[PDB]
């Protein structure tokens with residue numbers, strides 16, 4: 223199934239934050255209405271916050287997360303969870319190797335903000 | 337029901353990160369086996385990271401998040417989500433006021449690292 | 451924080467299914483726009499499906515689960531999770547006693563159908 | 565990433581329930597210590613419960629859900645969620661066609677029981 227794609231409410235500010243846990247340099251791209259709105263990169267095996275940014279979901283609400291390492295796309299897993307019918311998290315893990323820890327880049331999207 | 341309390345695998349490193357979305361200054365405490373292991377403070381209405389750290393779950397694996405604003409305890413909501421039977425997120429939202437957006441301090445715990 | 455209340459897309463068919471794990475008779479009421487639309491009762495310590503139904507979320511999309519044991523409300527816990535940005539689960543657990551297993555009545559809501 | 569595989573606590577009872585939403589007949593197999601422990605089959609486009617059982621998670625606690633329709637393996641999506649650090653849901657969706665609704669068979673695993 224497709225992973226790393228979330229439909230947010232339209233024209234809504236959200237946070238996006240990326241953590242690294244791999245010997246490979248991670249590149250995280252965040253697309254809004256199918257175009258790149260943000261790019262984060264770094265290399266850590268201790269969960270460094272390689273990027274964090276506030277974006278707007280735009281008229282479609284479509285947000286997509288992609289991850290690559292040395293130009294090779296990582297395998298993604300994802301889901302969304304809502305607490306008390308109000309607080310949203312869209313969660314992404316990624317695997318760039320063979321050990322299947324799926325933490326090589328971890329991305330958290332959250333809304334509402336403010 | 338209790339919220340903000342999680343049982344991690346014993347002797348396991350995990351990341352804990354907090355964001356703020358309120359006019360009030362957020363105080364986030366993270367307790368491991370009932371001892372304070374991290375404290376974050378800050379203010380933002382734009383999802384700023386007010387703290388991030390790597391901790392160890394110790395012999396008990398018990399992790400608890402508490403949030404307060406100028407001495408007043410915030411009401412908490414929480415859940416844990418596991419992706420591909422491997423990647424763990426423990427998620428906390430908090431309310432410091434009347435609007436019940438539950439984003440005033442937002443805490444994300446993730447493991448495994450490395 | 452409020453639990454057992456979910457906003458569905460308007461005018462959408464959803465499944466609702468209740469399970470029992472207690473010596474006490476569980477009464478599960480499912481409200482749509484604040485009026486009872488389905489009621490199930492039963493006693494089981496083996497996860498019996500004490501009822502299942504298809505309902506329509508109506509114009510408001512407001513769906514609420516209530517659980518009691520002979521008129522005494524149970525303590526509820528809940529969350530919503532979305533898989534591949536399509537498949538929705540609204541989840542409820544409840545506690546009717548002192549052991550805090552929170553499984554005494556369990557309710558699963560799922561959409562879309564068909 | 566692998567989907568429909570969950571590590572439960574060992575030697576622990578869990579409930580498994582399957583729903584159908586497709587013109588294709590769904591067959592769901594539930595495997596415990598890598599052997600089929602339950603098989604459910606049925607056809608519904610209205611969320612009919614096509615089977616439910618209580619099983620023991622065995623030595624490893626590894627539980628696997630597999631879904632097929634007319635002999636063809638369906639594409640799976642899954643996640644686990646834990647409420648108040650106690651109540652566990654393992655959730656499976658599946659796709660047997662081209663519309664990506666992932667509800668064609670829906671499987672819910674829950675524990676603890678009793």
Ligand SMILES: CC(=O)N[C@@H]1[C@H]2O[C@]3(O[C@@H]4[C@@H](NC(C)=O)[C@@H](O)O[C@H](CO)[C@H]4O[C@@]4(O[C@@H]2[C@@H](CO)O[C@H]1O)O[C@@H](C)[C@@H](O)[C@@H](O)[C@@H]4O)O[C@H](CO)[C@H](O)[C@H](O)[C@H]3O
Nearest residue numbers: 336357358359360381431432433434435436437438439440
């Ligand atoms: C009128 C006022 O300053 N109210 C704040 C409220 O911010 C407002 O923010 C709340 C604040 N209200 C005012 C008028 O200053 C006051 O009621 O305290 C709240 C916290 O108990 C404020 O909320 C937070 O809400 C604060 C609140 C914090 O306890 O303190 C009041 O005195 O901060 C705001 C910015 C939001 O993030 C809230 O979710 C958060 O709880 O809240 C309004 C929303 O209800 C609205 O955002 C106003 O613009 C804001 O001033």
Ligand SMILES: CC(=O)N[C@@H]1[C@@H](O[C@@H]2O[C@H](CO)[C@H](O)[C@H](O)[C@H]2O)[C@H](O[C@@H]2O[C@@H](C)[C@@H](O)[C@@H](O)[C@@H]2O)[C@@H](CO)O[C@@H]1O
Nearest residue numbers: 243244245246267317318319320321322323324325326450
């Ligand atoms: C031999 C080699 O170069 N392996 C890298 C692999 O890194 C190794 O991963 C191991 C654990 O699976 C150990 O940590 C080794 O010390 C390490 O060299 C690398 O894997 C990534 O980086 C490591 C540190 C972990 O975070 C992995 O989860 C992560 O996938 C991969 C990247 O594709 O390449 C080789 O296989």
Ligand SMILES: CC(=O)N[C@@H]1[C@@H](O[C@@H]2O[C@H](CO)[C@H](O)[C@H](O)[C@H]2O)[C@H](O[C@@H]2O[C@@H](C)[C@@H](O)[C@@H](O)[C@@H]2O)[C@@H](CO)O[C@H]1O
Nearest residue numbers: 471472473474495519545546547548549550551552554678
């Ligand atoms: C002695 C008695 O009748 N107690 C009732 C509870 O049943 C016992 O619960 C304990 C755990 O607290 C244990 O399971 C015993 O075997 C039960 O007899 C009863 O608890 C409810 O039913 C249980 C079977 C269990 O599912 C529990 O989680 C659930 O809350 C409570 C509430 O109905 O009432 C007591 O009188």
Ligand SMILES: CC(=O)N[C@@H]1[C@@H](O[C@@H]2O[C@H](CO)[C@H](O)[C@H](O)[C@H]2O)[C@H](O[C@@H]2O[C@@H](C)[C@@H](O)[C@@H](O)[C@@H]2O)[C@@H](CO)O[C@H]1O
Nearest residue numbers: 564585586587588609633659660661662663664665666668
């Ligand atoms: C023409 C036909 O019968 N096609 C079968 C699919 O049913 C149609 O699915 C489409 C969506 O792709 C749409 O709902 C049509 O009205 C159906 O007739 C069938 O899809 C499965 O059953 C559907 C009713 C729906 O639940 C869908 O999500 C599900 O995948 C597939 C099953 O492999 O077979 C087609 O031949």
Ligand SMILES: [Ca+2]
Nearest residue numbers: 319322323324
């Ligand atoms: Ca890896």
Ligand SMILES: [Ca+2]
Nearest residue numbers: 243244326450
């Ligand atoms: Ca890694």
Ligand SMILES: [Ca+2]
Nearest residue numbers: 432433437438
């Ligand atoms: Ca607030």
Ligand SMILES: [Ca+2]
Nearest residue numbers: 336357437440
């Ligand atoms: Ca706020």
Ligand SMILES: [Ca+2]
Nearest residue numbers: 547550551552
């Ligand atoms: Ca109980």
Ligand SMILES: [Ca+2]
Nearest residue numbers: 471551554678
């Ligand atoms: Ca019980």
Ligand SMILES: [Ca+2]
Nearest residue numbers: 661665666668
């Ligand atoms: Ca389908």
Ligand SMILES: [Ca+2]
Nearest residue numbers: 564585665668
């Ligand atoms: Ca379908």
